[PDB]
Paper text:
The design began with a requested secondary structure fed into the GM. The GM produced a primary sequence (nmt_0994) stochastically translated from that secondary structure; however, the Reverse GM correctly predicted that two of the requested helices were actually merged into one in the generated protein’s structure. EM-guided refinement then changed two residues to tryptophan, which raised the empirical stability score from -0.18 to 1.88. The nmt_0457_guided_03 and nmt_0994_guided_02 proteins, expected to be all alpha helical, show distinct minima at 222nm and 208nm, consistent with the intended helical structure. Five of the eight monomeric/oligomeric designs are highly thermostable; four do not unfold even at a temperature of 99°C. These four are precisely the non-aggregating proteins with stability score > 1, providing additional experimental validation to the previously published finding that stability scores are reasonably correlated with thermal stability. For one of these highly stable designs we obtained a crystal structure; this showed an all-helical structure, consistent with predictions of the Reverse GM, CD, and AlphaFold2. Two of the three helical segments observed in the crystal structure match AlphaFold2’s prediction, with the third helix taking a slightly different trajectory from the prediction. (C) Crystal structure for nmt_0994_guided_02 (dark grey), showing that it also has the three helices predicted by the Reverse GM for its pre-refinement progenitor. The prediction and the crystal structure have a CαRMSD of 3.4 Å. We found that one such model (trRosetta) could predict the crystal structure that we obtained for one of our designs with reasonable accuracy (CαRMSD of 3.7 Å), including correctly predicting the secondary structure and the relative orientation of secondary-structure elements, despite differences in finer details.
Here we describe a data-driven process for the high-speed, automated creation of stable protein designs. We describe a computationally efficient neural network, the Evaluator Model (EM), that is able to predict protein stability with high accuracy, based solely on amino acid sequence. We describe another neural network, the Generator Model (GM), that is able to create novel stable protein sequences at high speed; these sequences can also be successfully refined by the EM. Finally, we demonstrate via low-resolution methods that selected examples fold into stable structures, and report a high resolution crystal structure of one design that matches the expected topology.
Author numbering: 1 to 62
Amino acid sequence: DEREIARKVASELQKFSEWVKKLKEVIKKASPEQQTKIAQWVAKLAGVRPEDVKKIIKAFND
């Protein structure tokens, strides 16, 4: 069903947006060395590239 996937994806979008903002606040308080380090933790845990974590964070600032 299309409307149920849309309802589910949008709900997870609102929840995941909260965690991106918290990760942003942790990154905004970190030194440039720690910012790279935090992006490498998230990438190594989630199984993505460190650059993808930054592109995902970019899409949740607007």
